[PDB]
Design a protein around this ligand. Structure first.
Ligand SMILES: COc1ccc(-c2n[nH]cc2C)cc1F
Ligand SMILES: COc1ccc(-c2n[nH]cc2C)cc1F
Length: 209
């Protein structure tokens, strides 16, 4: 049972601007997604200080980067706090509306797309390199959910039947055909070292078989 939702106009406009604007510094998508994972891990680390049982779904706090040349996917996995259904459908987009307006106004005034993180809407930078994005996520208080969007003004949410995730978030970037450089170990290493070298959680770059 798959539910389809329309993005709010302002977010649709942002995604279309990201997809259609000519902008060569696409590699910053990885810094934004890793930064998102690191915030989610901070959040569950803090919550577990006053409630240790919140780590029963998994004590490890880490980020995994998994390229798959066969599926042409790059997956960013974290064991952070995860997202509820209300987050996917409503809350995160509600928050993003003001960041989106501020961002678009800065862009008209001379800012550039690489500054998207300073407006809290960095997640959407994934569409610099992905034609489709799947988010698998599990929060302690909700079921496991699969969110998916190929842009075009809509996204879907369904209960996920795949492997149980414990707690956390898996972002699967279905890469555009001309962006397969981001599946190369040497290229991901370079990007992590340049933009994420001081993240306070272990980042493991899986190598391909
Ligand atoms: C607090 O709301 C959240 C915002 C983002 C995430 C997230 N974790 N890993 C990737 C993402 C996008 C989790 C949240 F709970
Ligand atoms: C479910 O769709 C999402 C909508 C927004 C975000 C987000 N995370 N951090 C900042 C934003 C705008 C993540 C999502 F998965």
């Amino acid at each position: 049972e798959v539910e389809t939702f329309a993005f709010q106009a302002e977010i649709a406009q942002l995604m279309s601007l990201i997809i259609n604007t000519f902008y060569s510094n696409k590699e910053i998508f990885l810094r934004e997604l890793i930064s998102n994972s690191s915030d989610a891990l901070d959040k569950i680390r803090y919550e577990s200080l006053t409630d240790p049982s919140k780590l029963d779904s998994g004590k490890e706090l880490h980020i995994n980067l998994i390229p798959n040349k066969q599926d042409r996917t790059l997956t960013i996995v974290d064991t952070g706090i995860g997202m509820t259904k209300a987050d996917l459908i409503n809350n995160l987009g509600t928050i993003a509306k003001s960041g989106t307006k501020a961002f678009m106004e800065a862009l008209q005034a001379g800012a550039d797309i690489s500054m998207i993180g300073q407006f809290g809407v960095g997640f959407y930078s994934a569409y610099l390199v992905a034609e489709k994005v799947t988010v698998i996520t599990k929060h302690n208080d909700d079921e496991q959910y699969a969110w998916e969007s190929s842009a075009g003004g809509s996204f879907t949410v369904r209960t996920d039947t795949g492997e149980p995730m414990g707690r956390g978030t898996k972002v699967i970037l279905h890469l555009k055909e001309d962006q397969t450089e981001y599946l190369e170990e040497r290229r991901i290493k370079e990007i992590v070292k340049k933009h994420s070298q001081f993240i306070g959680y272990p980042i493991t770059l899986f190598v391909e078989k």
